[PDB]
Each structure stands twice: as C-alpha cells, then as structure tokens.
Amino acid sequence: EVQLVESGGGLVQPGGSLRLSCAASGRTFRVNLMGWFRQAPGKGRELVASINGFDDITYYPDSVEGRFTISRDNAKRMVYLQMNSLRAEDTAVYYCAAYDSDYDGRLFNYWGQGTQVTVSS
Amino acid sequence: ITNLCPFGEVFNATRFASVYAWNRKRISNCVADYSVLYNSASFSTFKCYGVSPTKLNDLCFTNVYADSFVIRGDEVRQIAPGQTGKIADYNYKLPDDFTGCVIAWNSNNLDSKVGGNYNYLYRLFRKSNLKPFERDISTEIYQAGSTPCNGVEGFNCYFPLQSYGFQPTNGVGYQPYRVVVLSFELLPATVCG
C-alpha cells in the first residue's frame, strides 16, 4: 500500500514561521511529484505548493508564493513545506499529496492524514 | 582567453526535462563551435528556419537560447512554426517568425524503462493555448465541464498532466526523443563563431 505520515505543525504566533514534513512509506511511486494542500474551516481544499522531484521545478499558486516554500529529500522519501510570516488567515489543516500513475498513464493522488496548524495571538 | 558556449551541458546532459516543463539555457558572451554539434552525435531531425547553418559561423547573435525537452517521436513534427496539437498548444509553441534551429534524436536507450518510464509528463488540457516560448508549470485541476471544480479531482475535473509510458519495446513513433531548439536573438552581440 501507500501511507503519507505528516509530522510537524502545531501552534504558531502571527508573523512566525513553521516547517511541516511528510514521510511516505509503501510502494514506490511511478512518478516523482508531490504537493501540499490546505483546507481551512468553511473553505474548500486549496493548493499551497507543488514540487516535481524528477525535475527541480516548483509551483506556487498566486495566493501564497513569496511566503511559503516546498522542498524534498528524495533519499528519505521526505517532503517539507516551510511557512514564513504566518498570518491568522493561514489557520488550517495541511495535507500531503503524492501523485502516481496508472497503467494508462492518468495521474492519481495518494493522501496523507494531515496536520493542523493554528496562528493565534 | 574567451570561453565557449556550454552546448555539451545542454545536449549531452544526463537527464532532460519534461516537455511541459521544458528547460531553457541562455547563451551569451561566448564563441560557439557548431562543427562539434553535427558530427558529435547522430540526430534524427535537424531543421533550421530563417537562418543558414553555413553562415552561422559568419553571423553574430546577441542572445542565443537552448530549449530542451523530451517527447515521443510522433510529436517531433510539432516542434516547428505554425503547428498544432497537444505539444504545440499546451507545452512548447514556436512562433511563426521562428529564426533558429530544431534538433532531435531518439533516446530509447536512456528515457524508457521496462514497464514504462512515467517520469516524463506532458499537458493534456488548458483553458487556452500557449503563447510562443511560454511555459506553464501549474498543477491545478482542469475544469472540463459545466460544474466548477474545487481543487478536487473528479467527474469532469482532471489533472492537467499525464505520463508518457516510455517502454524499450515501443514503436519508434512512441519512443522517447530528446529535442533541443536553438533560438537566435538579434538586437552589442556577445555570441559568434
């Protein structure tokens, strides 16, 4: 099977920083591209960052680009997301996403449990 | 002492980029050696538009650009001006006034694995076509129906990228092909021959 185990992420102060990590265990993925998602209470699941491990190419949606950064450790099967200048808007559950391919080539997605991060004064 | 352009780093690179995330290298302030380009390898495609290869040594360009990517053989015919298709519309589009060269060579011995090498991806859908030399690297789900999508894949909501299952037994048309496009800028020119 596959299992993304997310660690890091608790309580932070507005303007502070925080690094989340995610570790994959199970079958090796046919493709190397992962991402982090953020579901806020009362909102839909949002894309925060995506990293292609085969390449050195990262993608951040216009909502958060210069503030968050995504990195990877291929040997350890780790993926990290560092968040800086965190604001109260960022309170949410952060999820791990590991993309794979089917025989046909269509890309699907494995999910981690998610870790909650709150930014309160 | 004036160094030469790093064309070996581009062509003889160990790994090439996916077509959707085609890689680009700026080539300024050097003296290029085009002789080593032709006979250092066997290319299956070498087409130049708007420029002459014998006069490349006798011309000086301002800014040269080496774009590189990987696609399947069938798609090599799309890396040219005024072409359409998935690659030309959603991956790498060359302008109608392209002044450069397009080189490509089979790579089944490096970019294909038994059971499929799914690391090389390409874009299937976009809301619009790509302007010339535009790069789209977004991984937001594509809205393929009237129902809007909320960052969740599902019915009529598809991931925009798909993997080339490059196998070593595929047909020459479906095998991997490394492509290098040499764009020539004209505008102090720091490249020569």
Numbering used by the authors:
A (entry chain B): 1 to 121
B (entry chain A): 332 to 518, 521 to 526
Kindly provide excerpts from the paper associated with this entry.
SARS-CoV-2 infection is initiated by Spike glycoprotein binding to the human angiotensin-converting enzyme 2 (ACE2) receptor via its receptor binding domain. Here we report the discovery of a neutralizing nanobody named VHH60, which was directly produced from an engineering nanobody library based on a commercialized nanobody within a very short period.
To further investigate the detailed interaction between VHH60 and RBD, the crystal structure of the complex was solved to 3.40 Å. Some potential hydrogen bonds were found on the interface of VHH60 and RBD, representing the unique interaction network between the VHH60 CDRs and the residues within the epitope in the WT RBD. The epitopes on the RBD include Y351, T470, E471, Q493, and S494, most of which are conserved among the epidemic variants (except Q493R, a mutation was first founded in VOC Omicron (B.1.1.529), but reversion mutation R493Q was founded in the sublineages Omicron BA.4/ BA.5). Enzymatic digestion with custom-made Precision Protease and PNGaseF removed the His-tag and N-linked glycans, respectively. RBD (319–531) and VHH60 proteins were mixed at a molar ratio of 1:1.5 and further purified by Superdex 200 Increase 10/300 GL column with pH 7.5, 20 mM HEPES, 100 mM NaCl as running buffer after incubation on ice for 1 h.
